[PDB]
Amino acid sequence: VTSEQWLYWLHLYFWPLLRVLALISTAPILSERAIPKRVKLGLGIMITLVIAPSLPANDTPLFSIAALWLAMQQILIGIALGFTMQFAFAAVRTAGEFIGLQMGLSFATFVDPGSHLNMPVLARIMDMLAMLLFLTFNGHLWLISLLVDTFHTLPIGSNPVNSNAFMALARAGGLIFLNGLMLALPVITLLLTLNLALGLLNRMAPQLSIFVIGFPLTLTVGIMLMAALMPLIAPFCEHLFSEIFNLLADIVS
Amino acid sequence: SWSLSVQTLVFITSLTFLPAILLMMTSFTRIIIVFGLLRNALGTPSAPPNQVLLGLALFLTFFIMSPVIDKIYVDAYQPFSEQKISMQEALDKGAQPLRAFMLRQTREADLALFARLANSGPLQGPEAVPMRILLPAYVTSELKTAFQIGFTIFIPFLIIDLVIASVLMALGMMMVPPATIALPFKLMLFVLVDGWQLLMGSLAQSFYS
Amino acid sequence: QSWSLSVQTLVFITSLTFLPAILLMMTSFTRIIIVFGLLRNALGTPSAPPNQVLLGLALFLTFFIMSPVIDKIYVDAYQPFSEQKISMQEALDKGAQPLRAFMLRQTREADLALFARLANSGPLQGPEAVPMRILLPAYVTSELKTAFQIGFTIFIPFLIIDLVIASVLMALGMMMVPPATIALPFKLMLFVLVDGWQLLMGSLAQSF
Amino acid sequence: SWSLSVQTLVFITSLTFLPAILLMMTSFTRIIIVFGLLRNALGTPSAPPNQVLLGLALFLTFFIMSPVIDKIYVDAYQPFSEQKISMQEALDKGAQPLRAFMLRQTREADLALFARLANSGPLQGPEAVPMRILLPAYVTSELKTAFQIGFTIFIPFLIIDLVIASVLMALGMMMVPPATIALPFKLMLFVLVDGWQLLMGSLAQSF
Amino acid sequence: QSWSLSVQTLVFITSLTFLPAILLMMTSFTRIIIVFGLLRNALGTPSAPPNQVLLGLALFLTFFIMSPVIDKIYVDAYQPFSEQKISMQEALDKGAQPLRAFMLRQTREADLALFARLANSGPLQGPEAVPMRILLPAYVTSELKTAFQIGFTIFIPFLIIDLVIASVLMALGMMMVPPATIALPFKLMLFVLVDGWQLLMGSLAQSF
Amino acid sequence: QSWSLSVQTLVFITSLTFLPAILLMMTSFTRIIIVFGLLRNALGTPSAPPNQVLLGLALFLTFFIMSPVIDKIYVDAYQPFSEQKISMQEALDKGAQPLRAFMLRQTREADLALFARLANSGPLQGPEAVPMRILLPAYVTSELKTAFQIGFTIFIPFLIIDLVIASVLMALGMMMVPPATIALPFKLMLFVLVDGWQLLMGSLAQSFY
Amino acid sequence: VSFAGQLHAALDRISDRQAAARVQAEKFTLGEPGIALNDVMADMQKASVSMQMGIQVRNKLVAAYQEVMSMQV
Amino acid sequence: TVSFAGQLHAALDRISDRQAAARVQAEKFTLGEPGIALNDVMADMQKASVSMQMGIQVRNKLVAAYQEVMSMQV
Amino acid sequence: GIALNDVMADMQKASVSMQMGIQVRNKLVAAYQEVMSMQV
Amino acid sequence: TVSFAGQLHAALDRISDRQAAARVQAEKFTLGEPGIALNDVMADMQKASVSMQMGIQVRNKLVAAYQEVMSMQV
Amino acid sequence: SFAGQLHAALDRISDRQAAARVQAEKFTLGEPGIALNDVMADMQKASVSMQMGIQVRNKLVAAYQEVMSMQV
Amino acid sequence: TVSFAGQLHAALDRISDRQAAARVQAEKFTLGEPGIALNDVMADMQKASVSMQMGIQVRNKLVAAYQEVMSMQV
Amino acid sequence: MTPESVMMMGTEAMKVALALAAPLLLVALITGLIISILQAATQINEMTLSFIPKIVAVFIAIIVAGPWMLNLLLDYVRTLFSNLPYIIG
Amino acid sequence: DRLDAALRFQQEALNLRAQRQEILAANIANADTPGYQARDIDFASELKKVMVVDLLYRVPDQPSLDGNTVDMDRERTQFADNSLKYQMGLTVLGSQLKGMMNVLQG
Amino acid sequence: DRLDAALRFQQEALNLRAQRQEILAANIANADTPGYQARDIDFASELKKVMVRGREETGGVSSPAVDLLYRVPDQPSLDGNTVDMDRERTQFADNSLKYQMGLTVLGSQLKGMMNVLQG
């Protein structure tokens, strides 16, 4: 009596904690530095407390290279999930920064690339709008649910792994650009026409145009254009989230 | 009941988890995240020397959790101190008002998700939800609410920078940093519209609503 | 009635833990440190004087500003308590008075009203009815607001210099130069020819 | 085999140099420099976040190290359990695939320079190059390869920028900046040809 | 009157705790550090000399500058204390005098007046009786002002170079060529040719 | 005369903390990393190779440069220490001499004279009698000056490329074209074809000799 | 059933043992027949050992919790 | 209306009156006043010691919790 | 039943293994954050 | 006119006088000077130790508080 | 070179630990000629050597982290 | 010209000399030397331990100050 | 809470930004166009004389309409912070 | 206070043992007084009464001529027993206090 | 596995010390029982046996799988027990010190490990 076998409880509560905390430190909104560290640790601990008793406990000792392989596996799974989720916000940030750069908002990058003078304020605006939308669509709950679900697909125990699968996540790097253009294709196009229009004005009497009349007009036009374009991101926001989620579901397995 | 040595041991051990109660079961969490986000918004990552924000958050939490603490004291601490309720029942009696506050603010979707993740049976009413389901549901709801509040907070301070950059760009001053110009104007705004009274009242209502 | 000496020692050594909290929230340290941080931001260089120098200087300024309050506390509380003429609790109650007056003199009415509304306070009456737990957060809020009011107007001359230099440079034609790079030496020149440090300390002291 | 506590100390100490192992021993520097140069090419220094580029480079590094990881698993991970070979000898056997890889990716000139920097005259064979001479030479070779790949990426975008500016000048415009016009065309060219997947395929082929 | 040995070592360790504050606010470390940071900003190379290199250089320069004061403290105060000739209290009092004299030599009368008037000190006859609590903040403020003066003056030749290269580029029609890229190598050449490092350190030492 | 074992251990562990200071102010590292900090500026990419890659490359180059000095210290001083034929004090006295000679050969006479005058030192008969307090800051000053010389010289071919590209762009009437973005790939070309990295490291190593 | 349940069970067992020893000691001090001083003293010994075991378990458990809450996230 | 400061004051009072009662009992027993027993004196002193140890441990826990909360960054 | 000899020994191991896991994870997390805090 | 350094000096001096008085009393008792009792010697020695430990704790708290105040990011 | 010296130091520390452990193991079996005081002294010497190794590792790791955190 | 390195060397030499004297006296006492008493040996060992502890604490404070100063952002 | 509410508040925010920035941008554009057409009429072409009156005009714009912008933006922020606890989800 | 309730029984038992010890020693001291009655208390009943004193006369065994009913053997055995029980109560109370202390120490 | 194997020898020796002390206490308790042969175990042989093959029990009334050997009597006794009290108390004290030695060694090793896992 008075056994309280500690190794069994430790091995039951450790690896799910490692995977949950690995997702927490990288998953969007759950990985933002504004949350105190203890809150994140407690959330991981409580989620593991809820989940672990149902799972089959592992018996590999913590003092073995098998434990190191397990820890590497959990870290890989968590960071892969969090990063694949982060790709959508990367795409939204790309689209916003490009709209802002066609605004002429930061012209110093065309002359001094990476010269400590850059303000992608539109990128930040649409990034926080995307975060608000992600909060509204309860994406984080889904993330937690999928973190739990990847066990049935991929159990804690060391399992063999595949290859082109990693490429898929890396190939998801294309989406950030592709979908990014899909968010910027209308407005930039009209801005392009506006610039074309300015060109027609410069084909008249030489000089006396551009850098004096083009910038304010194009700034105001970009502002009101994409202010009107704001209602458009939400269907595209859901499209981006669905793309990331089903890509994750297909490739994680 | 337990022996007096066991009661003293349990009391001393339970005194350890006070930061955990403050962070994961109290209003403190969504009383901070908002402060950190606002500090990130104004462009002064130090400004109110942290400790100042922590003290303000502690006082706000103490003012907000007052009815819950009062109910715990009148229902659990008072009978326990008068030797009417045992030590192992005062905890159970006092965990109920905190659980109810934890519900009044915890969203549903989270409750459904964490009721599904535990493989628990159907929960027809809120009276069947245990603490193992309410705790992380409340935590997630508080995180989401804090982030929503902070992200709607962030908008005007970026609007000002946007208009500042556009105005600077109209005149061709393309090599002037916009952040350095915008920071005094952001401070001026936060001074003018009662920056703190409105935020304090909004957070307090956000709890009592 | 008086506490035992062991209880007095326990309370006295426990109260020293709140010394940084007292200095930050209850004294003039917060406003001075916020103004100093805003002034570095306004100088164009973010870390020219090390944080250590500014912290020590703010501590000295806080001590000099609060010296009359410290003297009043010593006359009222510390001296008659150390001579074993009053108890510890009564000494603390008596010594809380000058600090309460100092906190009240710089407290915004709206802050006090709001924090009395959130504390269910009903018929308050005399300015000498505000409890410490209500007075303290209102004082902190008023100090933050006042520090921001000072900082955003400290920012003004450096913005003037920046805008003037940028306008002159771009109107002359050299629009590819970074205006801040040329402006920083002139900001330093303005700060040293006005005696910015001395005048800033004078203004911060006079603000009380 | 030496003491278990010393083994724990050595293991935790070697865990610290993990960024050093990732940067100096694997290819991570090459992909990260290629990504930085490509970002500089499109004219937007903050379009994809640095975090995303770092993670993409990490995933690419993991795939491109997967054969070396498999060789390590065969030579070190497995026999350490069957105890046919173990300890430092097994560690060296497991590190052998890393050499082979770094010998493959290292130029001869860098190795020659770093040998004559260490007065290692009798280094005659090519499979007995010490780590001290192999590592910085490999890093320099990676820097050269990454710069070459970055220039190759630069060529088409420079061509597009030049073409846009030339058409603007020929059409009569002398004041319109060509960067604003050429940026969306750069993006539409990058997306339409699907630049990203071919870039990763070439990087994987680049070994 | 002599402190017991345990009290003496308690005082010694507690004083050793305050070492960085003494270095920053009583020696010449702060002015040299501020000038070095401003100079690094002035060359357009925000991170070329690592912070540790400049900190070590400032520490060595401070030691060399303060060697006469340390020698005076050793000869007049520390040596009799180490030979048990005088107690710790009088040794500290005697050691304060050379350091104060040094600090008074490098302070501005206006700042001393500001801190005296702020602290409500009575009239003080001559520099002989000025409390350290009054002298320390005034000396810190004077050091800040002098450091800013030196940095602003140092900023001039690089400004000349930037302006002349920008004008040369602009008069050629090169409208979109930024002048920083061309100016940085020439700033380095200018600083190298005039033997800038040793000259600036000699100038800093001579000003003390 | 030998120190006690406790004092020896205390001194050794205390001196282990000065490793970054010794590396920066006594070895080649200061000249290397600084030049790298400028080279990444000359190429037009402040990002360049990552900071850690450059730092580690500088560390390896520093070890290769100080290999003779390290070997001489190991032979003359540390070997009798391990083989018990010397004390810690005598080992510290003896092992510094090769490093002092290495520091002196790269020390400009003007800086050494400046620090002597500033320490009011007496007449130093010959290099061998120069105190370390005078040799250290003078070596650091000369090191900084030499690093700046090397960096400015490095800045030359990229300036040539920028000037040529800008002149070509302006001679064609393409005045509105920023030449930095055009000239960056050609700077990368120049660094690749000439084998810039290997040449630069060879030049640095030869410069220290 | 759960870890908290196991800890509660251990605390209840230890408290019950201590209360049993105390009650037997009070019964012996009362003068009631059949209670031997040997059994009283041995049961007090066992109760003290059990209390010390509980104290050690609490100490470690608190140490482990402090270690976990120091983990970086 | 609960008051944490009031509760701390009440607890400190409880400890201080326990200590003072034990001290006064020892006072009377030393002075030779009849009715005071040595075993009662020792038992009351030990009870006061236990109460003060209670107070010290609660102080330690509260100070540690406050320091860990205030050492956090927002 | 199980004696103090076994209870204490397994209790200590478990503590040791948990500390080892915590330290290894801390090293891994620090390395990851150092990698991600880069500048590209 | 209240100076904190003055109060620290006063407390330090008072601790020093207590320690010196206890030391001199023990010195005199050892030399066999009539009129000195061993119990008072030990009591004053223990009081000196208590005063010095109180000074140590106050210094520890003040130094810790100074380091926490002095390390904030301005 | 430097790695060789570190390897030699680690080998010496581990040989210390192994010798102490083997002596204690032999003494546990009741083997003659091994005294308790020698066992305890060897155990304490091994602990001291291991603590010295830990401290040296800590200082070296801190120095490496400080060096690698510089802004080029 | 007072140098801090000279003072540190002198302090280390004093600590080493005290430790060596205590060790030599203990070694001589173990070897049965007549004119050495046990109380003196133990007192000298305790004094050497106190001196070395003082040296360790001073080194710790100096290292903390140096690491604080060298961690600046200039 | 609903995405319609999110997009409505975003759109209103950025229309507030447009109202804040429109007078300054429009004044600068009008001044630039006027100076350009005057240059075309007079056959004068220097790229720097169009930069001079633009600064003066835009700076006067803050003199005249600055209080209106400051009152509009404060009202927007005040209303947003007051309605914050009613759009929580 | 809850601390009193835990230690009430042993403190009352210890005090009652001391009082009965005094009574027995008074019986021993007054052994030679003619006409002195040997008095004693019933420990269990008085312990009930204090937890929730009256002196009872001892039943004489041998009739003496001077009216003294104090018997040496009976009260010597009772005195030794009371001393033993006082020591046992001290041991139990000290053990309880020491346990309450090691619960707190840390 | 590695940590379990490294700490297994001293742990098993300490368990065998506990069982031997239980046996010695049983011998001391039965010291006045007529017709009780004193029992004891060979510590070294049983320790090696438990290491090569894991600990086992007769049942589980439960008892270890150790071989309870008889001690050779010193001098005869009419009641018929061979519990000689001097031998019992010498073995008891020796086993006590050896168990304390095992505790010291195991505690030193475990600290020697927490020191490493201490960063």
SS3 content of chain I, % helix, strand, coil (to 5): 80, 0, 20
SS3 H23: helix
State which amino acid sits at residue B83: Q
Cβ–Cβ below 8 Å for A101 and D43 = yes
Cβ–Cβ below 8 Å for B162 and M77 = no
Give DSSP secondary structure letters for L14-27: HHHHHHHHHHHHHH
- Of the candidates D34, D32, D48, the residue with the CA atom closest to the CA atom of residue D187: D48
Six-digit token string for E203: 């100038």
Query: End-to-end alpha-carbon separation of chain A, Å?
Result: 43
Rounded Cα–Cα distance for residues L18 and L7 (Å): 17
- Of the candidates C95, C68, C71, the residue with the CA atom closest to the CA atom of residue C81: C95
State which amino acid sits at residue A215: F
DSSP-derived secondary structure letter, E76: I
SS3 content of chain J, % helix, strand, coil (to 5): 80, 0, 20
Optimal mutation site among L3, L9, L12, interface F, most CBs of chain F within 10 A: L12
Six-digit token string for M49: 């004389």
SS3 O40: strand
- Other C-beta atoms closer than 10 Å to the C-beta of C70 total 17
- Of the candidates F36, F191, E181, the residue with the CA atom closest to the CA atom of residue D151: F191
Give DSSP secondary structure letters for G26-50: HHHHHT-TT--HHHHHHHHHHHHHH
- Other C-beta atoms closer than 10 Å to the C-beta of A243 total 17
For residue F117, the surrounding DSSP H or E stretch is helix F109-119
- Of the candidates E188, E192, E170, E190, the residue with the CA atom closest to the CA atom of residue E179: E170
- Of the candidates A66, A245, A62, A237, the residue with the CA atom closest to the CA atom of residue A158: A66
Rounded Cα–Cα distance for residues J14 and C182 (Å): 59
Pairing of strands N39-40, N56-57: antiparallel
**How was this one solved?**
cryo-EM
C174 conformational bin, left if phi > 0, alpha if psi -120 to 50, beta if neither:
beta
- I35 → closest Cβ in D8, D22, D35: D22
SS3 F86: coil
SS3 N56: strand
Compute and round to an integer the Cα radius of gyration of chain H: 18
- Of the candidates D96, D94, D27, the residue with the CA atom closest to the CA atom of residue D62: D27
CA dihedral over D40, D41, D44, D49, signed as positive or negative:
negative
Are residues A153 and A252 in contact, defined by beta-carbon separation less than 8 angstroms? Answer: yes
Optimal mutation site among I2, I5, I16, I27, interface O, most CBs of chain O within 10 A: I5
In A206-252 the beta strands, taken as DSSP E runs, fall at: none
Are residues D102 and D138 in contact, defined by beta-carbon separation less than 8 angstroms? Answer: yes
SS3 O39: strand
B39 conformational bin, left if phi > 0, alpha if psi -120 to 50, beta if neither:
alpha
Rounded Cα–Cα distance for residues M13 and F26 (Å): 59
- Other C-beta atoms closer than 10 Å to the C-beta of B119 total 9
- Of the candidates C12, D183, N64, C37, the residue with the CA atom closest to the CA atom of residue H59: C12
Structural domain count of chain M: 1
- Of the candidates B145, B92, B120, B27, the residue with the CA atom closest to the CA atom of residue B111: B120
Q: φ and ψ at A120, to 5 degrees?
A: -80, 70
* J-chain residues near C63 (CB < 8 A): 4
Distance of CA M56 to the CA centre of its chain: 16
Distance of CA G16 to the CA centre of its chain: 8
Rounded Cα–Cα distance for residues J51 and J55 (Å): 6
- C60 → closest Cβ in E44, E137, E144: E137
Cβ–Cβ below 8 Å for G29 and N103 = no
For residue O70, the surrounding DSSP H or E stretch is strand O69-70
- Of the candidates O102, O112, O110, O95, the residue with the CA atom closest to the CA atom of residue O11: O102
- Other C-beta atoms closer than 10 Å to the C-beta of N35 total 8
Cβ–Cβ below 8 Å for A133 and M35 = no
For this entry, resolution in Å reads 3.7
- Of the candidates A62, A23, A18, A88, the residue with the CA atom closest to the CA atom of residue A252: A23
State which amino acid sits at residue J41: V
Chain F interface includes I40 (CB < 8 A): yes
For residue N40, the surrounding DSSP H or E stretch is strand N39-40
Smallest Cα distance from D81 to chain O, Å? 11
Rounded Cα–Cα distance for residues M58 and C91 (Å): 63
Residue O69, beta-bridge partner list = O40
Six-digit token string for B67: 């009815």
Are residues B133 and B120 in contact, defined by beta-carbon separation less than 8 angstroms? Answer: yes
Which chains have at least 3 CB atom pairs separated by less than 8 Å from chain L?
C, E, F
Chain C interface includes B56 (CB < 8 A): yes
Pairing of strands N56-57, O39-40: unpaired
- Its domain, for residue M35, covers 1-89
Six-digit token string for H74: 């927002």
> At which residue do the structure tokens 């605006």 appear?
A125
Give DSSP secondary structure letters for D46-96: TSS-HHHHHHHHHHHHHHHHHHHHHHHIIIIITHHHHTSS-HHHHHHHHHH
Cβ–Cβ below 8 Å for K68 and F40 = no
- H63 → closest Cβ in C17, C21, C133: C17
Cβ–Cβ below 8 Å for F46 and A110 = no
Six-digit token string for C9: 């020692």
Six-digit token string for G25: 């000691």
Give DSSP secondary structure letters for K41-59: HHHHHHHHHHHHHHHHHHH
Nearest CA in chain M to B165: M21
Are residues D152 and D171 in contact, defined by beta-carbon separation less than 8 angstroms? Answer: no
Rounded Cα–Cα distance for residues L22 and E127 (Å): 51
Contacts of C167 (CB under 8 A, 6+ apart): B171, B173, M55
Cβ–Cβ below 8 Å for O2 and D9 = no
- Of the candidates C144, D143, N35, the residue with the CA atom closest to the CA atom of residue F39: D143
For residue O93, the surrounding DSSP H or E stretch is helix O85-114
* O-chain residues near I13 (CB < 8 A): 3-4, 7
* K-chain residues near F33 (CB < 8 A): 70, 72
Cβ–Cβ below 8 Å for K71 and E52 = no
Q: Long-range pairs for C187-190 at CB < 8 Å and ≥24 separation?
A: C187/C43, C187/C44, C187/C158, C187/C161, C187/C162, C188/C43, C188/E38, C188/E148, C188/E151, C188/E152, C188/E155, C189/E152, C190/C157, C190/C158, C190/C161
Q: φ and ψ at N24, to 5 degrees?
A: -65, -40
Contacts of C135 (CB under 8 A, 6+ apart): C100, C103, C104, C107, C112
State which amino acid sits at residue K49: S
Chain E interface includes C206 (CB < 8 A): no
Rounded Cα–Cα distance for residues C38 and C152 (Å): 8
Smallest Cα distance from A167 to chain M, Å? 34
Pairing of strands O39-40, O69-70: antiparallel
